[model samples]
Target chain A: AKIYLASPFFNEEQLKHVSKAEQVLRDLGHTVFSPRENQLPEVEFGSFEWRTFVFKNDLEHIKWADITFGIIGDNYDDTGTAWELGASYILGKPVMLFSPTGEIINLMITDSLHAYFEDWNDVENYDFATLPIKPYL
Target chain B: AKIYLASPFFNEEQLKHVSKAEQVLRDLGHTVFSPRENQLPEVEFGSFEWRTFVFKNDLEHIKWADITFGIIGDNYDDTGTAWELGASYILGKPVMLFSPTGEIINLMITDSLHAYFEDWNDVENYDFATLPIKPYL
Candidate 1:
């Protein structure tokens, strides 16, 4: 399945997690679209040009992907991650929340009975093969 | 102008704020689409039915509105508000963030220079009269 790996890339630790998540998802035979790997080379970071580039590119990836797998770690409430997750949910894409340290998610995002797990290994357990996107369409 | 008011509405305080916002915007002769006033009464809060109801309705309002006015108050980082703000931003809507107490917003979600204001009175200062949706389209 095509997946959008939504995670923070602001800090070194966040970048490390994004790298790990990308490796894990790719190893699981899923096509992952990561913003870190697809950033506009010419735009300066944090500029309006960069923000618009990311805004458009990320939304396109979210729309193209079958599902959005979000990483919510110790600093789980990153605004960018939340926005991606919310966009995925609003777009009717199935979302899987990955909390490496088992942090509780905001009640507004989920009902605590969703595709949530603490370990990255559990991602393989989801029945994405049989999940129908056509019905959502 | 048509406005989609995005804010947290879980508690009395939040509801009071929403009420005040609605009054302010309406008194300014703008049409406001507020979820708090139009929620499905029969659906139980936190249930899938409720989530689906709000999700579909809110997205429609975001699409219909000329601009999305988001209230990022003391608890400005509410997940639902973040999602709505993100959705509005991605949909090419000019987002005007209203932080009643002058609280700072996350750089990940905004450039810090995008139409942000400290008070409701400050909202009146923006030239919404000539803000066109045609250019974004």
Candidate 2:
């Protein structure tokens, strides 16, 4: 099953960081789809190509994916990710997060999270013991 | 039932203009719920007061009402409206918006409503005809 990771999809810094996580997910044999990759257009620094890209692939990926991932990076603090979360909630997809800056405290109220972590690296190497879902509760 | 027209609660400049719209909602004989009405301790100013003030009454009011009106006000944009939007989405409630200063030409893909807006004075009039469900579409 594939995972659709949602974020600003254009922030240079976070886009590069997602590259690392994409590599990790690829190595694990799970397909990784991101809005940044799907939403690229013929022209660089263009306008509605991004919107068209999302309207086409993002919705399809939301329907196809087994889970949705969010990177609540310090740059944008998860605005587009919130929209994707709403999409996932409406579609009944498992949603998770990897906050590259710190523990994402707002995940619970936003929706149910399979996991959240302090950093992308921690998320990449996590073995379930350190995942923040508080299994007992 | 009262309506919680959650705006971009953090942007003071945006708030200055949205206050005009709030007067509109109030003039319609509806109560407008805003988080800023509660005072906070100085050090924790940026933190959410969910337990003490925001969440309970917010959920209560949401349960009490049939519709939610949001204002996508301009500025930093990382406001508490995120939580409000999520909760509203989860409850399968209808969400509307007032496009504030910079939002007149925003993009929309598949929102139930691309946000409905009128001049601040029309808002005070509480004209539902002006507050359409899908304005941008």
What TM-score does prediction 2 earn?
Answer: 0.70
lDDT: worst 10-residue window of model 2 chain A: A128-137
Expressed as tens digits, the lDDT of each residue in A13-104 for candidate 2 is 87776887787777777788876665455545434455555455666787788877767656744545665665575567766766666633
C-alpha DockQ of every model:
0.38, 0.24
lDDT of 1 at A32: 97
What tens digits encode model 1's per-residue C-alpha lDDT throughout B29-98? 9999998887778799867688777777877899999888877766634667777777676677778777
lDDT of 1 at B60: 86
Candidate 2 local lDDT, B1-137, one digit each (tens): 26666656545776785577567777777677654564334435434443334445655666566666776644446324554555565566666666665344223212434345646654554445454444543
Assess the local accuracy of residue A135 in candidate 1 as a C-alpha lDDT between 0 and 100: 18
Taking candidate 1, what TM-score does its chain B reach relative to the real chain B?
0.84
Residue B17 accuracy (lDDT) in model 1: 81
Per-prediction TM-score, chain A only?
A: 0.83, 0.73
- What candidate 1 gets wrong by more than 4 Å, as runs, is A9-20, A37-45, A52-57, A63-66, A73-76, A89-94, A100-108, A111-118, A132-137, B10-17, B38-42, B73-76, B90-93, B101-108, B111-114, B132-137
lDDT for model 2 comes to: 0.58
lDDT of 1 at B90: 62
